[PDB]
Amino acid sequence: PFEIEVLLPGELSPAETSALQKCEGKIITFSTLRHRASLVDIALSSYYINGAPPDTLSLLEAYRMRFAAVITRVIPGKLLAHAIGVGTPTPGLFIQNTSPVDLCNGDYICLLPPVFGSADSIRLDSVGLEIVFPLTIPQTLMREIIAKVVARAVERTAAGAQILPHEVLRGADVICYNGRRYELETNLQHRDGSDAAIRTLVLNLMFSINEGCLLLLALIPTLLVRFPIYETISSWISTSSRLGDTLGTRAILRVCVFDGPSTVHPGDRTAVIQV
Amino acid sequence: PFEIEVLLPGELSPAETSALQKCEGKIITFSTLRHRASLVDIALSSYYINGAPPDTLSLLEAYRMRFAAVITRVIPGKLLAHAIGVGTPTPGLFIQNTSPVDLCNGDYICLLPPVFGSADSIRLDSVGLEIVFPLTIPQTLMREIIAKVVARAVERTDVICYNGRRYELETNLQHRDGSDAAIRTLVLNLMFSINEGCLLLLALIPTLLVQGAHDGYVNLLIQTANCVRETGQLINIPPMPRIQDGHRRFPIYETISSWISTSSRLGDTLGTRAILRVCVFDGPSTVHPGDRTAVIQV
Amino acid sequence: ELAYVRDGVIQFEVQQPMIARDGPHPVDQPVHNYMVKRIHKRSLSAAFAIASEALSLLSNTYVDGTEIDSSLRIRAIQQMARNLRTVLDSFERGTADQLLGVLLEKAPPLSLLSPINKFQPEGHLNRVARAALLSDLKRRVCADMFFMTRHAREPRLISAYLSDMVSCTQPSVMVSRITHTNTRGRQVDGVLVTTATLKRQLLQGILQIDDTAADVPVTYGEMVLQGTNLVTALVMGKAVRGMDDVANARVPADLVIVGDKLVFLEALERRVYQATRVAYPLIGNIDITFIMPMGVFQANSMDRY
Amino acid sequence: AIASEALSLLSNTEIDSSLRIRAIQQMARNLRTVLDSFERGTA
Amino acid sequence: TTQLIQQVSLTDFFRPDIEHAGSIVLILRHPSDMIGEANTLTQAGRDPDVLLEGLRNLFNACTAPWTVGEGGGLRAYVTSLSFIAACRAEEYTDKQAADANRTAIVSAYGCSRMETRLIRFSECLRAMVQCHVFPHRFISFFGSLLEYTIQDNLCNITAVAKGPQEAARTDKTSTRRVTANIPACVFWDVDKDLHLSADGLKHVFLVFVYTQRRQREGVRLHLALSQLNEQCFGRGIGFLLGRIRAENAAWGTEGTRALPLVQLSNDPTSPRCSIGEITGVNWNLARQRLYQWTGDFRGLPTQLSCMYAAYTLIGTIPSESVRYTRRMERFGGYNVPTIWLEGVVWGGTNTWNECYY
Amino acid sequence: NFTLTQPRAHVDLGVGYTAVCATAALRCPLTDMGNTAQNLFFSRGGVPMLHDNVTESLRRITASGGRLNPTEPLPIFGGLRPATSAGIARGQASVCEFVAMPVSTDLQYFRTACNPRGRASGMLYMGDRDADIEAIMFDHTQSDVAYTDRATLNPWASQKHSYGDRLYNGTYNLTGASPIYSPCFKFFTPAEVNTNCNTLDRLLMEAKAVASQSSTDTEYQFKRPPGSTEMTQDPCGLFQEAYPPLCSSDAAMLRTAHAGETGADEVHLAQYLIRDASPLRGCLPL
Amino acid sequence: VAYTDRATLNPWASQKHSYGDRLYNGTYNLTGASPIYSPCFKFFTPAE
């Protein structure tokens, strides 16, 4: 009937201690279930096999299958930690706001680490270990965001492959919510994740859609005014089932602030709770 | 909390008591929950009211209409059981392993009736009912099994590979009660994909083929694309469709959203919902098949 | 010991005085009317958040057998006692500052009562009397302005102020007139709150200290109700009280005499309201409007001579 | 059923004492009545 | 285990004094993204001018233009559901009691200058439903409201996640136990197939009807009480609304043959053109002899315009032999229909699904 | 957390005169006269407009003055407002309503203050007639108590249901909560009053218990935010009278070049001086 | 800011790049041996 406490580096560099104190309020990912998770990040990108190591899917799966933890103040000599995953519940937890997007209480929220552009992270030269903070967004808004990202990537690929320009100005593309402006696809450079890791997934989705629409258009419509030809259909069904299973639904997070402020900005007093 | 109480019928004891003792960590499932639980409405009710007893559709319907029930250690005093709706887990509800392949923590294993090798049947002399043992077959295995079944049904209008292991299977064309439902669902899904985005996607087929000359992924994409790459080059198709509403709204976003929604709906309909995630403690997660496996509530 | 009183009101027999004429009018009979009032309610809540370190330290039950944990526990209990004392003092100060002012809407009696006792004999006014009263009110509100502030250097308006006020003051009730008097035997009037500079100016100008008597009697006690009375009140729902009308700390306090009135001034500008997030009360506001012409001319023509 | 009255008595200076005494008397009367009913049923 | 959320409210759009304790309220959201996405939602099938005029007159009718319009920061969060429930109860073949209940409601809570605002809101919602903007993505669920207080244009609205009906014991009135009464006159009768003995953990489905008729499109509140999962209920809503689904499909088709290419692709010795495509010497000279098929996309530009199912799995009850009870009371001269629903718990996640099978 | 709550009740025993208040002080000024424009273009309906090439020029001309104006894309929808700019130490700007009246105006009436409403009204008739209150303010056919021969002034500004009630009052849901709010609307609609036993309480509650209608924190004269706590009084909001300030046709006479003592001229050629109704000349050097 | 009626006061030296800014400003000091003093630089750069 005990708990697990993280290690405390005693007599460290003043810069390292200052950085740890500054990042103390930031969310810290939980360690492994059994003993410890220190070389997992290093070994995650070890199978480069003479090329870019696919790590987006692996990190997404790790974040979905791993819980979180809340750290406390640092005291020289003794360290205290709190965990509500498999240990004992705690009477309220304080976590600083991280996601710049506005959030509303009384609604179910999900967790999904972004992979487009850049994300906040902490890295130390003398440590060599980096931690990526996932962004928490509601599922309803997340679905629209990912759909818009997929559409923008598809249109960018079409423009880059067709040679001639094909972008048609359909109007303003600025999303405004509670006085906050959010502009997407404001640039067409330094795209290190647009067609690097999700390119294979979007290509598979596109070819599956193409084969399905061809198969239905072959004989299905009738009111409009040695090869069994089944292995391809079976493979398409298997890939569709696999992607549906790997899509996942991580709705376990919730926000509930007692008499909190209306506007929300990074650096406020929020609460963390589950359902 | 709330729990389902199981009664003990009289004038019967030895055979069922021995079977329960041998089962140990084996669990069962219940359809209707009330103040008291019976034993007739598990197998006889499922196999009745149909005339010809089926093996796939009726079992799937019973599993969908049923719930999750666990069995703890049986005491000579009375029968004890716990429900999944409560949030107060108690150690002692560990179940046994009934899969030839070992499992590990980190997989969302669902439930499905045993179809690759059926299951053992125990004859009861007091009432005359059988007990169905749940299995932990991986999701991809049942997905490819149902894909083969629907392909065979479409053809009407047998060998699988798993890490080098192959074995002969049986046919599933004796019952057509679900074939019409599958045909209707696939017809509706195909009729839900009449959008114009596929033309735009196919407009980039030559460009993708040119770009893939040095990509190196053709050796892996050939197996998954054996007829689409041939049918896409056999149709001329309008290269530049006339613009009617592209100057006001982007149409590819709506088609992508609809495709994602229908794919998620099809996945939810086919794979249904699982029960719980299996997690073990103390020793390593590698557990020999056919032995005791630790099961906790997350 | 109250849960649902439905805004109870005490009962008393008070008859307003009436004038007597005995002129050209026959014998009449007295007429009286009964009215009801309402009772308001107020509440105040306080909180003091704390971390889990205090409870973790207090939930050890001497698990190590040393003096360090005992010292930590004693410092924690001392800190929590100090915090409790501080929040109690803050709550007391808040209630003290909230107790001042309950009728600020009708607080100024002069501008709303002087014409009533100056021109209206009994409140019955005809058209000409109403017009005269309206003209007098408009003249007063047009000529008053800040005349008293402008002529504050002349210390002779106090006599006029008291002469005007003596025609509007009426005696209070006599039944519930229990109060604490000084050694001289003169009943007090009330408590006046003013700024420190105003109090100093009044003390240097008129108010002279001549009395020294301070006491803090504790006579309210804690009344209790018998079980029989409680049950006989709760069987029907209505709660009864009374049934008697058959037929430590030291704080300085002084008093002053200004003739026929005994009013004491108690101002605490530096003692309290120090380093407090609550703003100073009694800060009112006024509104006014102005009208100006733009391109106006006379109608006639034989005026530029 | 005994959970409702027990919870009301547990989770909720003369009115409170009288209410507690009345609740205790009612609980004792109910217990006596249920014991008599059980004895009659057994007989 | 107890969580509370504090929200602000106004007086010109909500009067907490009339509403009693134990009521159920739903939190809305500002349409900041909806006013921008309506252009894409309306699509080329309809015009956005009607929606623009509707939102313009809605903003004009709404008070405090300096706060609302682009953010729900200083707006009334809690909104009474009685008005919308009564408004949407007209199409229920039961109006004798509704008219009697609404005659006093309009006289007391309404009057003054409210008919114009009510008509403006009704026409705005009719235009929103007609244009298929899907405004149901802002409806949530909350617990009972047993506490309310307001001093000056500020209501301290508080709520809880679960329901402590069996453990609150406020003892602030003559009653001994708390209760939560909410009218359920819009409860759809779905017992025609479950009239037999059915007991257990019944599930409540919040189904929204989305009709696609001619000038009679609207969303009406509906309730259900039956122990069912997401598959059987979906199949029931699929093959039980067949007539209205077919009518909507026929109305929405506001407007092409087979092809033998499959046979020639299946048989061997198929004409393959890969080296020529790679070289590019016949990029356009080889596709001129292919099958054009004379395809046209004018037959059906969109297919998601026939959605009629918006059920949400919100609300659970483990009590056996469920049976609603309706009594009669008075609030000073006007009776109110109240249902005794106390000593129950609720919970679960929202599942907004758009099914058009 | 430890939360403690204790209900408290307070009763009263003095129905008559008990409270005494007498204050006379001045603080730092907060707002002064303004020179801002008005959002007349925000009509939301009216005569159709098709001359875009001239309307854009008119908008540019009216925006080049330096007053408040919308952004470049012309956001006619929503509640978009221009960003607040810096301001010198002069006070808070305010709107200035314009009333069209004949130039011929009596000098005595201007000297003795004017009524923005047009005619004084009084509800002290004990409800003798429901239409009596409206008759005395919208009759314009009987002699007034202020004019021995005339009845009402500004015949081109005071009306019944053509100009006054159409624009100055605001009906058919046309008032709203726009920043350009008329301060005279608070005493335009009589609305409904409550009854009591004596008239003293009625006049006390009529002359008091007045809440604020705007905020002085911003120079744009925005509406009062919900939840604010402030107290203010409007003595001139019920008297229907406002004394004119110290103004003159020419500043040469007001400059007081001679200084020292002061004089009084009865008849002059074109120079006239009006004494201020508020004797505040000795407070602060003006 | 002061008088909204007019645009600005002294437009010839109100752009931070005028003749005075080119000559002295507060940190330019382009002269070789001119006898500069404190007021020639304190009138343009009032510290930070």
Which residue of chain A is at minimal alpha-carbon distance from E74? Answer: A262
Q: In whole angstroms, give the CA distance from residue B1 to residue A253.
A: 24
Angle subtended by helix axes E49-61 and E115-130, to nearest 10: 150
Please give the DSSP secondary-structure letter assigned to residue A25: S
* Residue B289 CB-density burial (10 A; 0-12 exposed, 13-18 middle, 19+ buried): middle
Q: In whole angstroms, give the CA distance from residue E329 to residue E175.
A: 15
Cβ–Cβ < 8 Å for A129, A41: yes
Angle subtended by helix axes C110-118 and F199-207, to nearest 10: 150
Q: Which of F91, E34, E292 is nearest to B199 (CA)?
A: E292
Smallest Cα distance from E169 to chain D, Å = 7
Give the distance, in angstroms, between the CA of residue F223 and the centroid of all CA atoms in the same chain.
Answer: 15
Q: In whole angstroms, give the CA distance from residue F181 to residue E177.
A: 50
Q: In whole angstroms, give the CA distance from residue C100 to residue C193.
A: 9
C-alpha torsion angle, residues A27, A33, A37, A39 (rounded to 10): -140
Any chain E CB within 8 A of the CB of D17? Answer: no
Cβ–Cβ < 8 Å for C208, C149: no
Cβ–Cβ < 8 Å for A158, A166: yes
Paired tokens of F46: 């009216």
After what residues is chain D interrupted, C–N > 2.5 A? Answer: 12
Identity of the residue in F104, F209, F283 whose CB atom sits nearest the CB atom of C105: F209
Which residue of chain B is at minimal alpha-carbon distance from A209? Answer: B198
Which residues of E are less than 8 Å from F209 in CB distance? none
CA-based radius of gyration for chain A: 23
Identity of the residue in F183, F199, F277 whose CB atom sits nearest the CB atom of C289: F183
Which residues of E are less than 8 Å from F173 in CB distance? 60-61, 113, 116
Q: In whole angstroms, give the CA distance from residue E126 to residue E90.
A: 14
Contact E167 D12 (CB under 8 A): no
Paired tokens of C7: 């805004």
Smallest Cα distance from D22 to chain E, Å = 15
What b/e sequence results for C38-70 when a residue is b if at least 16 CB atoms lie within 10 Å of its CB, and e otherwise? eeeeeeeeeeeeeeeeeeeeeeeeeeeeeeeee
What SS3 class is residue E294? coil
Chains D and F: 3 or more CB pairs within 8 Å of each other: no
Rounded to whole angstroms, what are the CA distances from A193 to A212, B5, F161? Answer: 28, 56, 68
Q: In whole angstroms, give the CA distance from residue C261 to residue C266.
A: 16
Quickly count: other Cβ atoms within 10 Å of residue B25's Cβ: 17
Paired tokens of E88: 């949407």
Quickly count: other Cβ atoms within 10 Å of residue A219's Cβ: 11
Contact F176 E113 (CB under 8 A): no
Q: In whole angstroms, give the CA distance from residue F235 to residue F241.
A: 10
F220 Cβ neighbours under 8 A, 6+ residues apart: F36, F68, F81, F84, F93, F179
What b/e sequence results for G9-48 when a residue is b if at least 16 CB atoms lie within 10 Å of its CB, and e otherwise? eeeeeeeeeeeeeeebbeeeeeeeeeeeeeebeeeeeeee
After what residues is chain E interrupted, C–N > 2.5 A? Answer: 255
What b/e sequence results for A133-152 when a residue is b if at least 16 CB atoms lie within 10 Å of its CB, and e otherwise? bbbbbbbebbbbbbbbbbbb
Contact A235 B224 (CB under 8 A): yes
Q: In whole angstroms, give the CA distance from residue A259 to residue A256.
A: 9
Q: Which of B170, B252, B148, B201 is nearest to A241 (CA)?
A: B148
Q: Which of E234, C68, C190 is nearest to A77 (CA)?
A: C68
Any chain C CB within 8 A of the CB of F21? Answer: yes
Q: In whole angstroms, give the CA distance from residue E239 to residue E331.
A: 44
Q: In whole angstroms, give the CA distance from residue E55 to residue E39.
A: 13
What single-letter amino acid sits at A125?
D
Rounded to whole angstroms, what are the CA distances from G33 to G25, G41, G43? Answer: 17, 16, 21
Please give the DSSP secondary-structure letter assigned to residue F214: B
Please give the DSSP secondary-structure letter assigned to residue F230: -
Quickly count: other Cβ atoms within 10 Å of residue F172's Cβ: 8
User: Which method was it determined by?
Assistant: cryo-EM
Identity of the residue in E39, E256, E268 whose CB atom sits nearest the CB atom of A224: E256
Contact E258 A229 (CB under 8 A): no
Rounded to whole angstroms, what are the CA distances from A237 to B150, C105, E258? Answer: 10, 78, 24
Q: Kindly report the backbone phi and psi dihedral angles of residue C34, in degrees, each rounded to the nearest multiple of 5, phi listed first.
A: -115, 135
**β-bridge pairing C191-192 and C264-265:** parallel
What b/e sequence results for D5-40 when a residue is b if at least 16 CB atoms lie within 10 Å of its CB, and e otherwise? eeeeeeeeeeeeeeeeeeeeeeeeeeeeeeeeeeee
Q: In whole angstroms, give the CA distance from residue E181 to residue E183.
A: 7
Q: Which helix (H) or strand (E) holds A201?
A: helix A199-219
Cβ–Cβ < 8 Å for E255, E298: yes
Which residues of A are less than 8 Å from C53 in CB distance? 80
Please give the DSSP secondary-structure letter assigned to residue C280: P
Q: Which of B57, B76, B74, B54 is nearest to B65 (CA)?
A: B57
Cβ–Cβ < 8 Å for E203, E226: yes
Cβ–Cβ < 8 Å for E293, B235: yes
Give the distance, in angstroms, between the CA of residue A214 and the centroid of all CA atoms in the same chain.
Answer: 34
Any chain A CB within 8 A of the CB of C52? Answer: yes
Cβ–Cβ < 8 Å for A108, A138: yes
Paired tokens of A84: 């509500």
Identity of the residue in E8, E69, E152 whose CB atom sits nearest the CB atom of F79: E69
SS3 content of chain G, % helix, strand, coil (to 5): 25, 0, 75
What single-letter amino acid sits at F256?
T
Q: Kindly report the backbone phi and psi dihedral angles of residue A194, in degrees, each rounded to the nearest multiple of 5, phi listed first.
A: -70, -45
Paired tokens of B90: 């108690």
Which residue of chain C is at minimal alpha-carbon distance from A82? Answer: C52
Strands (E) in A150-209, as ranges, are 174-177, 180-183
Paired tokens of C110: 């002069």
User: Bridge-partner residues for C297, per DSSP?
Assistant: F104
Q: In whole angstroms, give the CA distance from residue F98 to residue F114.
A: 15
Which residues of A are less than 8 Å from B280 in CB distance? none
- Render chain B in DSSP notation, one character per residue: -----B---SS--HHHHHHHHHHTT-----SS-SSSB-SSTTTHHHHSSSSS--SSHHHHHHHHH---EEE----SS---EEESSSS---TT--EE---SS---SS-----B---SS-------SSS----PPPB---HHHHHHHHHHHHHHHHHH--B--BTTB--B-----S--TTHHHHHHHHHHHHHT---THHHHHHTTHHHHHHHTTTTS-HHHHHHH-SSHHHHSSSB---SSPPPSSTTTS-HHHHHHHHHHHHHHHHHHHHH----------SS-S---TTSEE-----
Paired tokens of F138: 């919208």
Contact D11 E166 (CB under 8 A): no
* Residue A89 CB-density burial (10 A; 0-12 exposed, 13-18 middle, 19+ buried): exposed
Q: Which helix (H) or strand (E) holds E39?
A: helix E34-42
Q: In whole angstroms, give the CA distance from residue E134 to residue A31.
A: 42
Q: In whole angstroms, give the CA distance from residue E310 to residue E205.
A: 9
Cβ–Cβ < 8 Å for E223, E184: yes
Identity of the residue in F20, F232, F270 whose CB atom sits nearest the CB atom of C285: F232
What SS3 class is residue A181? strand
Q: Which of B56, B43, B69 is nearest to B122 (CA)?
A: B43
Paired tokens of C58: 């207090």
Paired tokens of A212: 């399905």
Angle subtended by helix axes A231-247 and A199-219, to nearest 10: 130
Which residues of E are less than 8 Å from B192 in CB distance? 303, 356
- Render E310-353 in DSSP notation, one character per residue: ---EEEEE--SS----EE---SSS----EEB--S----------
Which residues of B are less than 8 Å from A238 in CB distance? 140, 143-144, 147
Paired tokens of B97: 């392993």
Which residues of E are less than 8 Å from A275 in CB distance? 347, 349
Q: Which helix (H) or strand (E) holds A122?
A: strand A121-123
Q: In whole angstroms, give the CA distance from residue B146 to residue B179.
A: 11
Quickly count: other Cβ atoms within 10 Å of residue A228's Cβ: 11
Cβ–Cβ < 8 Å for B139, B146: no
What SS3 class is residue A273? strand
User: Bridge-partner residues for E203, per DSSP?
Assistant: E226, E316
Paired tokens of B29: 């499932």
Restricting to E residues 286-305, those with a Cβ less than 8 Å away from any Cβ of A are 299-300
- Contact pairs from chain C to chain F, CB under 8 Å: 158
- Render F34-85 in DSSP notation, one character per residue: ------TT--SS-S----HHHHHHHHHHHHTTSS----TT---SS---PPPP
Smallest Cα distance from G2 to chain F, Å = 5
What single-letter amino acid sits at F146?
A
**β-bridge pairing E202-205 and E313-317:** antiparallel
* Geometric angle at alpha carbon E78, from E77 and E84, rounded to 5°: 120
Cβ–Cβ < 8 Å for C57, C76: yes
HSE on the CB side for A139, CA within 13 Å? 17
Restricting to F residues 164-183, those with a Cβ less than 8 Å away from any Cβ of G are none
**β-bridge pairing A78-82 and A94-96:** unpaired
Q: Which of E194, E235, E242, E218 is nearest to E131 (CA)?
A: E218
Restricting to E residues 105-144, those with a Cβ less than 8 Å away from any Cβ of A are 137, 140, 142
Q: Which of E207, E219, E214, E247 is nearest to E353 (CA)?
A: E207
What SS3 class is residue A130? strand
Q: In whole angstroms, give the CA distance from residue E18 to residue E14.
A: 9
C209 Cβ neighbours under 8 A, 6+ residues apart: C203, C254, C256
User: Bridge-partner residues for F171, per DSSP?
Assistant: none
Stated length of chain A: 275
Q: In whole angstroms, give the CA distance from residue F134 to residue F122.
A: 10
Largest pairwise CA distance in chain F: 81
Q: In whole angstroms, give the CA distance from residue C104 to residue C126.
A: 31
Q: In whole angstroms, give the CA distance from residue E225 to residue E318.
A: 11
Smallest Cα distance from C43 to chain D, Å = 22
Chains G and E: 3 or more CB pairs within 8 Å of each other: no
Any chain E CB within 8 A of the CB of C4? Answer: yes
Q: In whole angstroms, give the CA distance from residue B79 to residue B71.
A: 9
Quickly count: other Cβ atoms within 10 Å of residue E298's Cβ: 10
Q: Token pair 């200058």 is at which residue?
A: E113
What SS3 class is residue C155? coil
Cβ–Cβ < 8 Å for F201, F185: no
Q: Token pair 């309310």 is at which residue?
A: E148
Q: Which of F132, F127, F133, F121 is nearest to F196 (CA)?
A: F127
Cβ–Cβ < 8 Å for E274, E164: no
Paired tokens of C122: 């009994």
Q: In whole angstroms, give the CA distance from residue B55 to residue E55.
A: 57
**Long-range contacts formed by F194-201: CB under 8 A, 24+ apart:** F197/C33, F197/C35, F198/C123, F199/C123, F199/F124, F200/C116, F200/C123
E245 Cβ neighbours under 8 A, 6+ residues apart: E306, E308, E356, E357
Number of H helices and number of E strands within chain F? 6, 2
Which residues of A are less than 8 Å from E261 in CB distance? 218
Which residue of chain C is at minimal alpha-carbon distance from F279? Answer: C145
